[PDB]
Design an enzyme around this catalytic site. Structure first.
Site, PDB file in Angstrom:
ATOM      1  N   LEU A   1      44.806   4.615 -25.465  1.00  0.00           N
ATOM      2  CA  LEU A   1      43.848   4.415 -24.033  1.00  0.00           C
ATOM      3  C   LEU A   1      44.677   4.236 -22.758  1.00  0.00           C
ATOM      4  O   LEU A   1      44.576   5.108 -22.146  1.00  0.00           O
ATOM      5  CB  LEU A   1      42.923   3.414 -24.383  1.00  0.00           C
ATOM      6  N   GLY A   2      45.574   3.418 -22.848  1.00  0.00           N
ATOM      7  CA  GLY A   2      46.367   3.194 -21.666  1.00  0.00           C
ATOM      8  C   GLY A   2      47.521   2.115 -21.865  1.00  0.00           C
ATOM      9  O   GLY A   2      47.464   1.216 -22.734  1.00  0.00           O
ATOM     10  N   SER A   3      48.410   2.031 -20.954  1.00  0.00           N
ATOM     11  CA  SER A   3      49.519   0.963 -20.977  1.00  0.00           C
ATOM     12  C   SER A   3      49.072  -0.002 -20.118  1.00  0.00           C
ATOM     13  O   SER A   3      49.053  -0.053 -18.858  1.00  0.00           O
ATOM     14  CB  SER A   3      50.724   1.507 -20.589  1.00  0.00           C
ATOM     15  N   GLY A   4      48.592  -1.088 -20.599  1.00  0.00           N
ATOM     16  CA  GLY A   4      48.250  -2.540 -20.109  1.00  0.00           C
ATOM     17  C   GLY A   4      49.515  -3.217 -19.366  1.00  0.00           C
ATOM     18  O   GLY A   4      50.560  -2.682 -19.263  1.00  0.00           O
ATOM     19  N   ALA A   5      49.317  -4.394 -19.116  1.00  0.00           N
ATOM     20  CA  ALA A   5      50.461  -5.272 -18.335  1.00  0.00           C
ATOM     21  C   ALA A   5      51.059  -6.044 -19.518  1.00  0.00           C
ATOM     22  O   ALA A   5      52.152  -6.463 -19.247  1.00  0.00           O
ATOM     23  CB  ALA A   5      50.047  -5.913 -17.300  1.00  0.00           C
ATOM     24  N   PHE A   6      50.399  -6.267 -20.607  1.00  0.00           N
ATOM     25  CA  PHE A   6      50.700  -7.094 -21.653  1.00  0.00           C
ATOM     26  C   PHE A   6      51.168  -6.358 -22.914  1.00  0.00           C
ATOM     27  O   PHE A   6      51.664  -7.055 -23.868  1.00  0.00           O
ATOM     28  CB  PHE A   6      49.894  -8.221 -22.081  1.00  0.00           C
ATOM     29  N   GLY A   7      50.666  -5.008 -22.874  1.00  0.00           N
ATOM     30  CA  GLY A   7      50.719  -4.360 -24.070  1.00  0.00           C
ATOM     31  C   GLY A   7      50.103  -2.933 -24.059  1.00  0.00           C
ATOM     32  O   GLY A   7      49.286  -2.794 -23.221  1.00  0.00           O
ATOM     33  N   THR A   8      50.276  -2.131 -24.762  1.00  0.00           N
ATOM     34  CA  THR A   8      49.661  -0.923 -24.821  1.00  0.00           C
ATOM     35  C   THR A   8      48.310  -0.847 -25.721  1.00  0.00           C
ATOM     36  O   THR A   8      48.231  -1.458 -26.620  1.00  0.00           O
ATOM     37  CB  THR A   8      50.452   0.370 -25.541  1.00  0.00           C
TER      38      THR A   8
ATOM     39  N   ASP B   1      43.923 -13.357 -14.750  1.00  0.00           N
ATOM     40  CA  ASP B   1      44.332 -12.120 -14.566  1.00  0.00           C
ATOM     41  C   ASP B   1      42.994 -11.295 -14.230  1.00  0.00           C
ATOM     42  O   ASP B   1      42.984 -10.087 -14.574  1.00  0.00           O
ATOM     43  CB  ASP B   1      45.294 -11.645 -15.602  1.00  0.00           C
TER      44      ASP B   1
HETATM   45  N1  LIG Z   1      37.631   0.885 -23.354  1.00  0.00           N
HETATM   46  C1  LIG Z   1      38.240  -0.219 -23.826  1.00  0.00           C
HETATM   47  N2  LIG Z   1      37.214  -1.144 -24.702  1.00  0.00           N
HETATM   48  C2  LIG Z   1      37.800  -2.096 -25.200  1.00  0.00           C
HETATM   49  N3  LIG Z   1      38.638  -2.732 -24.895  1.00  0.00           N
HETATM   50  C3  LIG Z   1      39.942  -1.921 -23.779  1.00  0.00           C
HETATM   51  N4  LIG Z   1      40.669  -2.826 -23.384  1.00  0.00           N
HETATM   52  C4  LIG Z   1      41.284  -4.007 -24.110  1.00  0.00           C
HETATM   53  C5  LIG Z   1      41.351  -5.230 -23.132  1.00  0.00           C
HETATM   54  C6  LIG Z   1      41.901  -6.495 -23.641  1.00  0.00           C
HETATM   55  C7  LIG Z   1      42.193  -6.544 -25.018  1.00  0.00           C
HETATM   56  C8  LIG Z   1      41.939  -5.441 -26.017  1.00  0.00           C
HETATM   57  C9  LIG Z   1      42.400  -6.049 -26.963  1.00  0.00           C
HETATM   58  N5  LIG Z   1      42.644  -7.350 -27.041  1.00  0.00           N
HETATM   59  N6  LIG Z   1      42.565  -7.679 -25.833  1.00  0.00           N
HETATM   60  C10 LIG Z   1      42.707  -9.026 -25.260  1.00  0.00           C
HETATM   61  C11 LIG Z   1      41.592  -9.681 -25.203  1.00  0.00           C
HETATM   62  C12 LIG Z   1      41.311 -10.955 -24.607  1.00  0.00           C
HETATM   63  C13 LIG Z   1      40.179 -11.723 -24.582  1.00  0.00           C
HETATM   64  C14 LIG Z   1      38.881 -11.109 -24.986  1.00  0.00           C
HETATM   65  C15 LIG Z   1      39.056  -9.876 -25.703  1.00  0.00           C
HETATM   66  F1  LIG Z   1      37.927  -9.292 -26.246  1.00  0.00           F
HETATM   67  C16 LIG Z   1      40.217  -8.943 -25.809  1.00  0.00           C
HETATM   68  C17 LIG Z   1      41.329  -4.214 -25.363  1.00  0.00           C
HETATM   69  C18 LIG Z   1      39.563  -0.843 -23.219  1.00  0.00           C
HETATM   70  C19 LIG Z   1      40.051  -0.229 -22.358  1.00  0.00           C
HETATM   71  N7  LIG Z   1      40.661   0.970 -22.289  1.00  0.00           N
HETATM   72  N8  LIG Z   1      41.484   1.283 -21.100  1.00  0.00           N
HETATM   73  C20 LIG Z   1      41.031   2.588 -20.609  1.00  0.00           C
HETATM   74  C21 LIG Z   1      41.699   2.968 -19.048  1.00  0.00           C
HETATM   75  C22 LIG Z   1      43.365   2.608 -19.455  1.00  0.00           C
HETATM   76  C23 LIG Z   1      43.553   1.669 -19.986  1.00  0.00           C
HETATM   77  C24 LIG Z   1      42.786   1.006 -21.316  1.00  0.00           C
END
Ligand SMILES: Nc1ncnc(Nc2ccc3c(cnn3Cc3cccc(F)c3)c2)c1CNN1CCCCC1
Length: 284
Positions: free
Chosen positions: A17-24, A127
């Site tokens: 999906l994408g490169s986050g700040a704490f992980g991919t 954040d």
């Molecule tokens: N479309 C999505 N659907 C679901 N999650 C997503 N991101 C996501 C965020 C946080 C996440 C995870 C898995 N662990 N944690 C940590 C966490 C902490 C607290 C509650 C909790 F539930 C989770 C996944 C996306 C995003 N995709 N984007 C698209 C654009 C480019 C960057 C990526």
């Protein structure tokens, strides 16, 4: 079990999906029936992680994402329900021409409700930003990624442009510093995804903030709305609105949207199918 410990074979990372700040973050399928999920892999001592993780799995609010499981192999993988519409930042940027005042104000209400819930759980996000608000459906958004910041030493010896002054200067994080970040998130939405303090070096942010400089009034914003944003950025943390108060006020505005946001052609307003593609975790 509230926090399911998944076997490395129960799920599989298919696409990125994408490169986050704490992980991919990856898009994938969880086969306990295939459940579409988002899997975040971070960059024993896993007891602290499992403890912090538990909090993430025990939240139950329609405007807050919940962690479903975790896999502790060589690395730590967090599993949560996939939000097919992606993050709100990209969403508003992509629909900058079809987003009405009604939707913007309601998203502000939903984000405030989700944050007030975290406040009740004594959980500081640390954040909050439009990139960390996900779209379940255009009429339903949710906050995610809370807790990770602390789990990785946020307040131990950095999204500077979203941080409250006290967080920048003294690593002080409270529900009121989250209010500041909420103010910035709202600004990102009202400007349809503009980057805050674009061009300005992060190293100089604390300086301009102390001088009283703040993000500019979004063009579609009446002074009524902009004032709310400015209040969220007051140096005196205790003077900032409380999320409980923000829910009430934006809810008020949501009843008469066109009075608070001026959007041309408001009254008349790719697609994640071929983008993302089984039982929805919600149904499961
Ligand atoms: N479309 C999505 N659907 C679901 N999650 C997503 N991101 C996501 C965020 C946080 C996440 C995870 C898995 N662990 N944690 C940590 C966490 C902490 C607290 C509650 C909790 F539930 C989770 C996944 C996306 C995003 N995709 N984007 C698209 C654009 C480019 C960057 C990526």
């Amino acid at each position: 079990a509230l926090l399911r410990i998944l076997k490395e074979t129960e799920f599989k990372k298919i696409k990125v999906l994408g490169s986050g700040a704490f992980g991919t973050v990856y898009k994938g399928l969880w086969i306990p029936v295939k459940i579409p999920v988002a899997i975040k892999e971070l960059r024993k001592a896993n007891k602290e992680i499992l403890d912090e993780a538990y909090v993430m799995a025990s939240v139950d609010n329609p405007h807050v994402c919940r962690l479903l499981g975790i896999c502790l192999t060589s690395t730590v993988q967090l599993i949560t329900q996939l939000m097919p519409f992606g993050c709100l930042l990209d969403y508003v940027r992509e629909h900058k021409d079809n987003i009405g005042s009604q939707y913007l104000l309601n998203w502000c209400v939903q984000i405030a409700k989700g944050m007030n819930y975290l406040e009740d759980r004594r959980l500081v996000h640390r954040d909050l930003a439009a990139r960390n608000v996900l779209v379940k459906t255009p009429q339903h958004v949710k906050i995610t990624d809370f807790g990770l910041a602390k789990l990785l030493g946020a307040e131990e010896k950095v999204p500077i442009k979203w941080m409250a002054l006290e967080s920048i200067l003294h690593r002080i994080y409270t529900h009121q510093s989250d209010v500041w970040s909420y103010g910035v998130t709202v600004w990102e939405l009202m400007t349809f995804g503009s980057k805050p303090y674009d061009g300005i070096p992060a190293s100089e942010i604390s300086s301009i903030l102390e001088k009283g400089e703040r993000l500019p009034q979004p063009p579609i914003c009446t002074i009524d709305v902009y004032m709310i944003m400015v209040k969220c950025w007051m140096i005196d943390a205790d003077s900032r609105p409380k999320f409980r108060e923000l829910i009430i006020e934006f809810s008020k505005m949501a009843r008469d949207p066109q009075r608070y946001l001026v959007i041309q052609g408001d009254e008349r307003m790719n697609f994640y199918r071929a983008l993302m593609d089984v039982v929805d975790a919600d149904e499961y």
